[PDB]
Amino acid sequence: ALTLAMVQRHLQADLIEDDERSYVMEQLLPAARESAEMFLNRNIYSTSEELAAAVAAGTAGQYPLVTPRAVEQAILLMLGDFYRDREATGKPVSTSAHNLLYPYRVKVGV
């Protein structure tokens, strides 16, 4: 559910200090979430209420879904990659998160 407890258990880290907890939960998690959102070619919402609210205001695009567990763990994997290494070493384009994220992709083609 991408709460604080799940992130704490994934990273095996206690985020006691306000500064690093703020860093991890406000600059490192939204980055992964919106990266997966950009890759999927669709908008993802946490609960049904948020999806309905976004559709009502018209800001939600076509083909929206509420996040399954596979997409949430792909986001967790991206976050775990972000936490570990903090440089620009150069990596393969298709990692192990894309294998989980791919079946939910939409608008593929040429």
Binding site: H10, Q12, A13, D14, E17, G80, R84
Partner: protein
């Protein structure tokens, strides 16, 4: 390069109550600190266990090493006067570790090493 997920063991750090008893010996009661996670590295190989200790008194002591994240060393202050409890899976007998000092690295500020004794239980 800390590689979380290798920190698969849940330990239990705890320190001793302050003060002294009537004679001045350390109080044999133990308080609590909390739980952390670490990677335990054994001493494989022959002759890795020490038998005699002092005036011909038998013993069996084998030192280990716990690699922990840098946060557990800043939240508390682990030093030589603490003990660490860890439980083997599906077992009721729990190892008692005796901290002999903490080695901190400056090459990267995301690791620390706690060297324990694990041989004879502490009180």
């Amino acid at each position: 390069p800390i590689s979380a997920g290798s920190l698969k063991t849940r330990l239990l750090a705890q320190r001793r109550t302050s003060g002294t008893d009537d004679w001045g010996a350390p109080v044999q009661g133990w308080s609590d600190l909390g739980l952390f996670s670490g990677d335990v590295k054994n001493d494989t190989g022959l002759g890795a266990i020490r038998t005699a200790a002092g005036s011909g008194l038998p013993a069996s002591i084998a030192k280990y090493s716990i690699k922990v994240r840098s946060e557990v060393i800043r939240r508390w202050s682990i030093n030589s006067a603490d003990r660490i409890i860890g439980r083997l899976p599906f077992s009721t007998q729990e190892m008692v570790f005796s901290v002999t000092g903490v080695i901190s690295d400056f090459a990267d500020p995301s690791m620390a090493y706690i060297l324990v004794e694990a041989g004879a239980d502490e009180q």
